[PDB]
């Protein structure tokens, strides 16, 4: 019984991701998040070892083993008209969209640390066979005391494959020009495009493109003072041709990415 194993608290938010409540695991008082998803609103389905669950549950189980920069699925339940997902909640926490809104454009030292952690989390997903397909500031939680970033909201994701994708339900302003123009993309190179959008967002205070014509136009205007090394990495991630984009290895070996702060240093300098 779900209702007796958890004490439900205030609604945290609702949207394309469902309705998410704060919560407490009654057994050990562990802080949790309780996500409800109506069955009628679930487009992709999958199967675990043997049970017909939302694809989101399939993907979360593949990435939730061991420690990583992904919010871990602790449990799930099936209800007559919905699935309920129990997720580990850091406290205190703030999502990266609210963080950038309040702080403005981030110092490059802080964006380097954040962007590095996001890269490691995406690499972990891909190593687990999981393509997230909705990387953006809204889908990244910051553990303010530990200085650690966590990916959330796999409801637009897919199993990772090397063949072309012709479906997409992530966030359009982070989607690549080959999706806009052709409704085709490949997993890794599309992820790198969204990472370029995310990095620009971090160092400029907002995303570079709002309209389809800007996305496919491939001109990056910098509205804030940004170092030449960082501008180069961003424009590389945002190459119009997918095969001109860097691999994850090339991103992490880029000169702008060197000498990253540790998570605890990041909290003590920038978050505490």
């Amino acid at each position: 019984p779900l209702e007796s194993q958890y004490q439900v608290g205030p609604l945290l938010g609702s949207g394309g991701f469902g309705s998410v409540y704060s919560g407490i695991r009654v057994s050990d008082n562990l802080p949790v998040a309780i996500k409800h998803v109506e069955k009628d609103r679930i487009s992709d389905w999958g199967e675990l070892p043997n049970t017909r669950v939302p694809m989101e549950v399939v993907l979360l189980k593949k990435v939730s083993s061991g420690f990583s920069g992904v919010i871990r699925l602790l449990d799930w339940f099936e209800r007559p008209d919905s699935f309920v997902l129990i997720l580990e909640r850091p406290e205190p926490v703030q999502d990266l969209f609210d963080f950038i809104t309040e702080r403005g454009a981030l110092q490059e030292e802080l964006a380097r640390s954040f962007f590095w952690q996001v890269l490691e989390a995406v690499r972990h997903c891909h190593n687990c066979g999981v393509l997230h397909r909705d990387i953006k500031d809204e889908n990244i939680l910051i553990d303010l005391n530990r200085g650690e970033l966590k990916l959330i909201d796999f409801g637009s994701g897919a199993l990772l494959k090397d063949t072309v994708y012709t479906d997409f339900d992530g966030t359009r302003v982070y989607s690549p020009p080959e999706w806009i123009r052709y409704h085709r993309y490949h997993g890794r190179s599309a992820a790198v495009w969204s990472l370029g959008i995310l990095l620009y967002d971090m160092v400029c205070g907002d995303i570079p493109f709002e309209h389809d014509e800007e996305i496919i136009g491939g001109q990056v205007f910098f509205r804030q003072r940004v170092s030449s090394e960082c501008q180069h990495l961003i424009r590389w991630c945002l190459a119009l041709r997918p095969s001109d984009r860097p691999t994850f290895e090339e991103i992490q070996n880029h000169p702008w990415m060197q000498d990253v702060l540790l998570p605890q240093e990041t909290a003590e300098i920038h978050l505490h």
């Binding site: 949207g15 991701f17 809104t101 953006k136 809204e138 637009s156 339900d169 966030t171 907002d206």
Partner: peptide, 8 residues
Amino acid sequence: RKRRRHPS
């Protein structure tokens, strides 16, 4: 200049 969330 307005900054906004975007649904998915």
